[PDB]
DNA sequence: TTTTTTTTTTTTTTTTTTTTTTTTTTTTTTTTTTTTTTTTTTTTTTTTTTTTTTTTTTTTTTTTTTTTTTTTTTTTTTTTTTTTTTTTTTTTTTTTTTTTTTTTTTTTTTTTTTTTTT
């Protein structure tokens, strides 16, 4: 799990996470919640 | 009139130093070889309407393992000190300006003499 890009979250605005074969996604900053440091997963996308 | 003392430049040739001819090593320089940029056209790639059957997101509910959590003791973080490097004031040296002071060299042309080589 090698930590490809931080991103902050500036304003209410539409985030678009991308794949290396050609995946491609958008959705908005209001969806993924929010935690402290050393947490877990929040699946982005359908990998594989 | 004969004979006696002292002084120096030469027979000097050898030791020391200097001058003058030499050729190993890091810094230049010309060559070939590989990175860049602009055109033709060319099959080839690629942009944009229409239809279509698809396959993933959103009604609703479930749980469990990552999100809660408190606390011991480490260990990265910060503090002081000192060394190494970077960078800029300071100083020194050198060059150019225009009137002055000084100098120094290379060749033709002919005819005669020295001065080496064969």
Do not use: C, F, H, M
């Amino acid at each position: 799990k090698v930590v490809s890009l931080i991103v902050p979250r500036g304003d209410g605005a539409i985030l678009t996470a991308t794949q290396n074969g050609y995946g491609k996604r958008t959705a908005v900053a209001e969806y993924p919640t929010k935690s402290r440091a050393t947490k877990g997963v929040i699946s982005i996308k359908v990998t594989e």
